[PDB]
Amino acid sequence: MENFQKVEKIGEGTYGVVYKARNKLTGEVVALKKIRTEGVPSTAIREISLLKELNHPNIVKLLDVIHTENKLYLVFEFLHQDLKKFMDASALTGIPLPLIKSYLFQLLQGLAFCHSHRVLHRDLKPQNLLINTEGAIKLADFGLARAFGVPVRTYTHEVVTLWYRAPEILLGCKYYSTAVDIWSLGCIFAEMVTRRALFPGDSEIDQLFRIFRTLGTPDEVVWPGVTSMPDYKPSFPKWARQDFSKVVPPLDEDGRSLLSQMLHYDPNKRISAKAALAHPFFQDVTKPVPHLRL
């Protein structure tokens, strides 16, 4: 738009292009996202305008919504790097546990806040977790999945990742809960520790089976109601549960106990963000500053 000088393209998102731009009136650098056609649904207009209100230090702020000339642009506060880049940079040494613990703790604060307002992300992944020089980490694109249903292929045909998707979603459950975000967070948590994706599926069935091989094929004992799920099939291979010590070495007992609670099959059993902040694993959390070169 006119009130903004595009400085550069930051990337090819799920919904559209993302540019770093300078607001000519405030002079502030901002993240400008062009979204996605019949003349923009008023329902999406209302969903988004509600997000303008839930502000938290661990949530990327939605500064403005520009629906000019039947087009939609969302203006978000700008952050320099995402967790995905940072992990690729700390591949050799790994991210230090104190930083891992600080980031998970902040993430859970942002989640607890949104969840208390009944707002889900539904599409958590490293790429939408943004970090700054002072040791902060913020959740980006919160609530947009609800406003604009998460696509299979992005506008540039990029296949959207299934890696962090909760099993109830993969089994065709249509009424997701806040528990889906906890599952995603547990997957990212494991990835930060081992420096390898936990369940890197390349199809919905492959993703489902990767989950089954590790956590064991679910049944009516661990997940009551599972066999009645829309896409559940009695013909699923029956796999045994692997030991967490083998799944996430060298995570200590507290971290492994926490992860196991975030990875419970049954959504009603899965630990809540608010409950997780009180877990012993956070007893010694601090706020270290990351080693990020811009």
Curated annotation (Swiss-Prot):
Residues the entry annotates as binding ATP: 10-18, 33, 77-79, 82, 125-128, 141
Catalytic activity: L-seryl-[protein] + ATP = O-phospho-L-seryl-[protein] + ADP + H(+); L-threonyl-[protein] + ATP = O-phospho-L-threonyl-[protein] + ADP + H(+)
Cofactor note: Binds 2 Mg(2+) ions.
Annotated localization: Cytoplasm, Cytoskeleton, Microtubule organizing center, Centrosome; Nucleus, Cajal body; Cytoplasm; Endosome
Outcome of mutating residue 162 to R: Reduced phosphorylation by CAK and reduced kinase activity
UniProt activity-regulation remark: Phosphorylation at Thr-14 or Tyr-15 inactivates the enzyme, while phosphorylation at Thr-156 activates it.
One of the GO biological process terms: positive regulation of DNA-templated transcription
UniProt KW keywords: Acetylation, ATP-binding, Cell cycle, Cell division, Cytoplasm, Cytoskeleton, DNA damage, DNA repair, Endosome, Kinase, Magnesium, Meiosis, Metal-binding, Mitosis, Nucleotide-binding, Nucleus, Phosphoprotein, S-nitrosylation, Serine/threonine-protein kinase, Transferase
Positions carrying Phosphothreonine: 14, 156
Sites of Phosphotyrosine modification: 15, 19
UniProt enzyme class: transferase
Residue positions, PTM N6-acetyllysine: 6
Effect listed in the UniProt record for changing residue 156 to A: Abolishes activity
GO molecular function: ATP binding; cyclin binding; cyclin-dependent protein kinase activity; cyclin-dependent protein serine/threonine kinase activity; magnesium ion binding; protein domain specific binding; protein serine kinase activity; protein serine/threonine kinase activity
Positions bearing N-acetylmethionine: 1
Keyword Repressor: no
PANTHER family, per database record: CELL DIVISION PROTEIN KINASE (PTHR24056), CYCLIN-DEPENDENT KINASE 2 (PTHR24056:SF521)
Subunit structure, as described in the record: Found in a complex with CABLES1, CCNA1 and CCNE1. Interacts with CABLES1. Interacts with UHRF2. Part of a complex consisting of UHRF2, CDK2 and CCNE1. Interacts with the Speedy/Ringo proteins SPDYA and SPDYC. Interaction with SPDYA promotes kinase activation via a conformation change that alleviates obstruction of the substrate-binding cleft by the T-loop. Found in a complex with both SPDYA and CDKN1B/KIP1. Binds to RB1 and CDK7.
Name of the protein this chain belongs to: Cyclin-dependent kinase 2
Species the sequence originates in: Homo sapiens (Human)
Gene label: CDK2
